[PDB]
RNA sequence: CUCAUGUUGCCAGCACGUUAUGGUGGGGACUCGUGAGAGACUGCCGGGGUCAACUCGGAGGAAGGUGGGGAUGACGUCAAGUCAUCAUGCCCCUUAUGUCCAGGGCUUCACACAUGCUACAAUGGCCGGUACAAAGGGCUGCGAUGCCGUGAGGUGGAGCGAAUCCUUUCAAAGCCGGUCUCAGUUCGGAUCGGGGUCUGCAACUCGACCCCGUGAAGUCGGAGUCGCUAGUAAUCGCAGAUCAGCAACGCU
RNA sequence: AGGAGGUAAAAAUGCCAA
């Protein structure tokens, strides 16, 4: 992302519906989970590294 | 007393046995009102038929989970196990018919990339 | 029979029979028959002139159908194409007026499919 | 269609501008970027230049144009054919 | 089945009549994943045939079956760039399946407004040896006999 | 009497096991009635993710999150039992809700 | 993409999580704080090998455990570097930060540190073959290590091509779940770009 | 299958309930939830096997011959994809190729391809009654009984950080009964006219849903081609992520 | 260990780096 956009996403928007997510680690607007605040890529990386307490590879 | 359970693809039943006549009570309803289907009724009554001891048993059941055919299978298995608990020598006849074998057939997990289970989406090499 | 200019089908249950009027459907037929008092399961054969009068009276009093409705519809289309609205331009070009996908579909507005 | 409880949507900028022009009774061309404001009966006699994204197109209001948004009368994309 | 034959499924005996042929017919007329509907259709057809003839529905169904069951078949294989139709014997189970499928498929094409009626009429007609299924069996036998010259491949 | 309900939430299994043991030992050292570690159904929050950046959508990879629960109930909460239960130290992976 | 991260493959069975805390309503804040913390500690000190960073949180107090190759550089004797890093962790407003610096006992048995050392060598000027061989020998000397595989791919020696080279010794059963596999990966900064070094070190099995 | 286990989960034996139900005092009995463990190993028998693998058959068992399904991609190939997750060598912009805002576009349409959904009807459509699931989600969220609307919905706020409460006590196909009577129809639902609700600063370009009217093509589809071998194909409904609201007929 | 019989309608081209 562009640092202008990354910052602007944290500013208080003048209208409520103007705010979006923008993953904390990498600033990727698309595919961001609400629980982690990480995009899919950063979530996969950090979960494989084991830095999500409780997130583990699933198989059922 | 006597209790036993049957399970078939997410349908569990518990059968309490009474040695009276042959009436059926499934959560307060008869075998005709509960399972109003001839094939299922025969599936329920088959172990009694093969053991030749029909209408010696009143039974009360609790059927939770699954659907009609699954509950029929569960009730069949529970009835067969109750007959074994009553008389062990029934086992050569009952088990030979397969009425004691729990059917381990359950829904297959849906897998990603496929539309459901094993059916794959349409393909074109063009 | 004959109703407000429409020759009703020979043998139909009444609630279906009235739907052949341009301004009436199933819900309107059920409403009309219930308000008037004539059974909706009644055939069109046994229909009686006294009944025909009562249905004609009620529907003329309480609904605008047939030529009036049709001319009102074309008048509204005419107004919106007159004022030059976006919907008017869509009506002109013969394309979907509700913002529907035009890239591939909309063959029902484009009519028969002509190849290039 | 906006709910009736909320009432018609006219943004205060052009609402006040039109009020001023019709209070002074002078019919001047209004340059506005508001495609999202509905037309109110007080707008019958005025003329608007609304933005189509590229230029300002003059729009003259009539009686039959009451209840529609300003933007409807300025086409945006241009199609001539193939 | 490159490594061998597959095991065959355990068909059950019908409750109402006690013939497994009735259950096989129910399975072949089954559609859309609804067993009870097909079961009821077959029961209605059997009752209608029983009413029409005054005899045993299972007996008349069996009679229709061995009236439509074919004995010699045609299996096509291309030999030397020109395809040939090779007469081949049929095993009883294959014949029964083929006859049942012909019966149902041709009964769905009848004109009597309800499947519970078309199936009964087609079964009755085949019991009399007149129906489209019987005609189909006749054409199959005719095409089997027309190419006895090509039975020498024996494949 | 008074009933004090202790709820244990954990991501790991052995952590909740050890916490339940320690809670029981501590309270019964003070002479109070315990029902025991009653288990509860474990939540599973599932997340499916495309493995690669930029397309290749049919290749996905599934994650899960397990939340195990045990229920601890003490009867006749002696003030000494309450005081001990406030002072009990437990690992970070466990969450103790006292009420 | 062929092989998954071994640490994530074995997370529930052999290995453990690098951060232990539980919060449901605060999960977002906790994870963003953790990302800030790890970014800070990664960008700060490259001199001393930072083998692993562990974070524990309980209410207001925050505990950070860091494993290091040489703690002498991590904290000044007067406490200067500790003062800097605690000041940064207070900038990250974790409220109370009880910070412990720990020393990893065997240096060449840790795959992360092996990869870091090979990256240092390969970044200065060292030949990649020499780097891999030195790493393999150093790791195999120590007893607990059973097998090791060292792989580095990129522009090796300044060539205008992408070459991948892997050196193996002993046993590296990647597909064995009970096998204690410790994985490490570093990206070396050179003049011709950035090249990565992955190391697998297999030290017996874990039987639970 | 065994041991442990009794709440918010079950209720066999007791009692209290009477409208409404385990609803309540109580009870571990059967479920069930989740911990520990047993249990398939050609383990036994018979025949083939070089007396070896391994194979054919049988008993016992819930299961028999890698029980079913997941997770699991060796060395490499395609200069395969991604400098738009991120990082980075080199080159280029720096008064713009940076950055702020309003409006617009990414939805344009004479066409072609591809993936799907609804259908073309009677194994069906419509109407009334009635029976059975699992898995999930919920804090400035899920939001009940009730009152007002025909219906989207409005007022209100019970109760729940949830085995408790809400998402109805949870389904649709299914079963029973009535009607339609083979027809471009009581099929089909597009398109179009009118009247509304809700989210939202804002539904014109460009949201979803409801009511009234409208009632197109479509009669099982050419050459050709696709998926699937048991709880599989075929169908029937349900929940979630993203999300204020949704283009969800998509994906899991 | 020795040994016999039977077994193909048509199907063209593909640029000169890495
Ligand atoms: Zn990210």
From Swiss-Prot, chain A:
- What is the name listed in the Swiss-Prot or TrEMBL entry for this protein? Small ribosomal subunit protein uS14B
Please give the GO cellular component terms listed in this UniProt entry. Answer: cytoplasm; small ribosomal subunit
- Function as written in the Swiss-Prot or TrEMBL entry: Binds 16S rRNA, required for the assembly of 30S particles and may also be responsible for determining the conformation of the 16S rRNA at the A site.
What family is it from?
A: Belongs to the universal ribosomal protein uS14 family. Zinc-binding uS14 subfamily.
Q: What quaternary structure, including any partners, is listed in this protein's UniProt entry?
A: Part of the 30S ribosomal subunit. Contacts proteins S3 and S10.
State the species of origin: Mycolicibacterium smegmatis (strain ATCC 700084 / mc(2)155) (Mycobacterium smegmatis)
Describe how the cofactor binds: Binds 1 zinc ion per subunit.
Instruction: Please give the Pfam families that the UniProt record associates with this protein.
Output: Ribosomal_S14
Curated annotation (Swiss-Prot), chain B:
Q: Which residues form a coiled coil?
A: none
Question: For this chain's UniProt record, which GO biological process terms are given?
Answer: translation
Q: Which domain of life is it from?
A: Bacteria
Q: Which UniProt keywords apply?
A: Ribonucleoprotein, Ribosomal protein
List, alphabetically, the GO terms of the cellular component aspect: cytoplasm; small ribosomal subunit
Q: Name one GO molecular function term.
A: RNA binding
Of which family is this protein a member? Belongs to the universal ribosomal protein uS9 family.
| Stated name of the protein | Small ribosomal subunit protein uS9
The species is Mycolicibacterium smegmatis (strain ATCC 700084 / mc(2)155) (Mycobacterium smegmatis)
| Encoding gene (name) | rpsI
Show which stretch of the intact protein is covered: 25 to 150 of 150
Swiss-Prot record, chain D:
GO cellular component terms, alphabetically, are:
cytoplasm; small ribosomal subunit
Keyword field contains Nucleus: no
Superkingdom as given in the UniProt entry: Bacteria
Q: Annotated Gene Ontology MF terms?
A: rRNA binding; structural constituent of ribosome
Which residue ranges traverse the bilayer? none
Keywords for this protein:
Ribonucleoprotein, Ribosomal protein, RNA-binding, rRNA-binding
GO terms, biological process: ribosomal small subunit assembly; translation
**Family designation:** Belongs to the universal ribosomal protein uS19 family.
The role this protein plays is: Protein S19 forms a complex with S13 that binds strongly to the 16S ribosomal RNA.
The record's listing under HAMAP family reads:
Ribosomal_uS19 (MF_00531)
Please report the name of this protein according to its UniProt entry: Small ribosomal subunit protein uS19
- Phylogenetic lineage: Bacteria, Bacillati, Actinomycetota, Actinomycetes, Mycobacteriales
Gene encoding the protein: rpsS
Swiss-Prot record, chain F:
PROSITE patterns noted in UniProt: RIBOSOMAL_S10
Quote the Pfam families the UniProt record gives. Answer: Ribosomal_S10
**Which SMART domains does the entry link to?**
Ribosomal_S10
Per UniProt, the keywords (alphabetical) are:
Ribonucleoprotein, Ribosomal protein
A biological-process GO annotation = translation
Ribonucleoprotein found in the keyword field: yes
MF terms in GO:
structural constituent of ribosome; tRNA binding
- Record has Lyase as a keyword: no
The record's Gene Ontology cellular component field reads: ribonucleoprotein complex; ribosome
Function statement: Involved in the binding of tRNA to the ribosomes.
Q: Oligomeric state and partners?
A: Part of the 30S ribosomal subunit.
Task: Give the family this protein belongs to, as stated in its UniProt record.
Answer: Belongs to the universal ribosomal protein uS10 family.
What this protein is called in its record is Small ribosomal subunit protein uS10
* Organism of derivation: Mycolicibacterium smegmatis (strain ATCC 700084 / mc(2)155)
Q: What is the lineage of its organism?
A: Bacteria, Bacillati, Actinomycetota, Actinomycetes, Mycobacteriales
């Amino acid at each position: 992302a562009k640092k202008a956009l990354v910052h602007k996403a944290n500013k208080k928007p003048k209208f409520a519906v103007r705010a979006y997510t923008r993953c904390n680690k990498c600033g990727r607007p698309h595919s961001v989970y609400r629980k982690f605040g990480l995009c899919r890529i950063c979530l996969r990386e950090m979960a494989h590294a084991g830095e999500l307490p409780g997130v583990q590879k699933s198989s059922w | 007393p006597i209790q036993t359970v049957g399970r078939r693809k997410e349908a569990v039943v518990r059968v309490r046995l009474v040695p009276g006549t042959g009436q059926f009570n499934l959560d307060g309803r008869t075998l005709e009102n509960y399972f109003p289907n001839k094939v299922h009724q025969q599936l329920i009554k088959a172990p009694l038929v093969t053991v030749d001891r029909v209408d010696q048993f009143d039974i009360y059941a609790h059927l939770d989970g699954g659907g009609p055919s699954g509950q029929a299978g569960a009730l069949r298995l529970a009835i067969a196990r109750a007959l074994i608990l009553v008389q062990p020598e029934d086992r050569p006849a009952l088990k030979k018919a397969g009425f004691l074998t729990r059917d381990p057939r359950a829904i297959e997990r849906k897998k990603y990339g496929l539309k459901k289970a094993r059916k794959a989406p349409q393909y074109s090499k063009r | 029979a004959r109703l407000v200019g429409v020759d009703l089908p020979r043998d139909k249950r009444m609630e279906i029979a009235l739907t052949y009027i341009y301004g009436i459907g199933r819900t309107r037929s059920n409403e009309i028959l219930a308000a008037t008092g004539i059974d909706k399961n009644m055939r069109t054969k046994d229909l009686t002139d006294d009944q025909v009068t009562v249905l004609r009276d009620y529907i003329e009093g309480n609904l605008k159908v047939e030529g009036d409705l049709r001319r009102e519809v074309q008048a509204d289309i005419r107004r919106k194409i007159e004022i030059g609205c976006y919907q008017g331009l869509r009506h002109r070009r013969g394309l979907p007026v509700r913002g529907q996908r035009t890239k591939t579909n909309a063959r029902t507005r484009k009519g028969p499919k002509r190849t290039i | 269609p906006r709910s009736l409880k909320k009432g018609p949507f006219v943004d205060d900028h052009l609402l006040k501008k039109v009020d001023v022009q019709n209070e002074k009774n002078t019919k001047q061309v209004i340059k506005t970027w508001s495609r999202r404001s509905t037309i109110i009966p007080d707008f019958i006699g005025h003329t608007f230049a609304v933005h189509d994204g590229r230029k300002h197109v003059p729009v003259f209001v009539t009686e039959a144009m009451v209840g529609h948004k300003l933007g409807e009368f300025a086409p945006t994309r241009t199609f001539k054919g193939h | 089945p490159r490594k061998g034959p597959a095991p065959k499924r355990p068909l059950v005996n019908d409750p109402v009549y006690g013939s497994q042929l009735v259950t096989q017919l129910v399975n072949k007329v089954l559609l859309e994943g609804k067993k009870s509907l097909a079961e009821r259709i077959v029961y209605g057809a059997l009752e209608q045939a029983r009413e029409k003839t005054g005899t045993d529905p299972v007996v008349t169904l069996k009679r229709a079956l061995d009236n439509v069951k074919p004995a010699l078949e045609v299996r096509s294989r291309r030999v030397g760039g020109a395809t040939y139709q090779v007469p081949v014997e049929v095993r009883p189970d294959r014949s029964t399946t083929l006859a049942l499928r012909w019966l149902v498929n041709f009964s769905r094409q009848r004109r009597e407004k309800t499947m519970v009626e078309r199936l009964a009429n087609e079964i009755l007609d085949a019991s009399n040896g007149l129906g489209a299924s019987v005609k189909r069996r006749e054409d199959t036998h005719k095409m089997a006999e027309a190419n006895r010259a090509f039975a020498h491949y024996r494949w | 009497g008074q009933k004090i309900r202790i709820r244990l939430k954990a991501y790991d299994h052995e952590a909740i096991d050890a916490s339940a043991r320690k809670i029981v030992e501590t309270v019964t050292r003070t002479g109070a009635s315990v029902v025991g570690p009653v288990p509860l159904p474990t939540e599973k929050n599932v997340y499916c993710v495309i493995r690669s950046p930029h397309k290749y959508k049919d290749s996905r990879e599934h994650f899960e999150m397990r939340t195990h629960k045990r229920l601890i109930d003490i009867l006749d909460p002696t003030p000494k039992t309450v005081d001990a239960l406030m002072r009990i130290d437990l690992p970070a992976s466990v969450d103790v809700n006292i009420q | 993409g062929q092989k998954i991260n071994p640490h994530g493959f074995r997370l529930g069975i052999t290995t453990e999580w690098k951060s232990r805390w539980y919060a449901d309503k605060q999960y977002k804040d906790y994870v963003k704080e953790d990302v800030a913390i790890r970014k800070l500690l990664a960008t700060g000190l490259e001199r001393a090998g930072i083998a692993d960073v562990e974070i524990e949180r309980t209410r207001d107090r925050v505990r950070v455990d860091i494993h290091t190759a040489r703690p002498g550089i991590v904290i000044g004797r007067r406490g200067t570097e500790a003062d800097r890093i605690r000041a940064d962790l207070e900038k990250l407003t974790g409220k109370q930060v009880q910070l412990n610096i720990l020393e990893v006992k065997n240096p060449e048995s840790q795959a992360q540190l092996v990869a870091q050392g090979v990256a240092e060598q390969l970044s200065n000027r060292v030949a990649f073959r020499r780097a891999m061989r030195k790493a393999i020998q150093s790791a195999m000397r120590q007893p607990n290590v059973k097998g090791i595989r060292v792989q580095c791919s990129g522009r090796l020696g300044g060539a205008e091509m992408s070459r991948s080279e892997f050196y193996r010794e002993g046993r590296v059963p990647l597909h064995t779940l009970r096998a204690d596999i410790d994985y490490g990966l570093y990206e070396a900064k050179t003049t011709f770009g950035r090249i990565g070094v992955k190391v697998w070190i297999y030290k017996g099995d874990i039987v639970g």
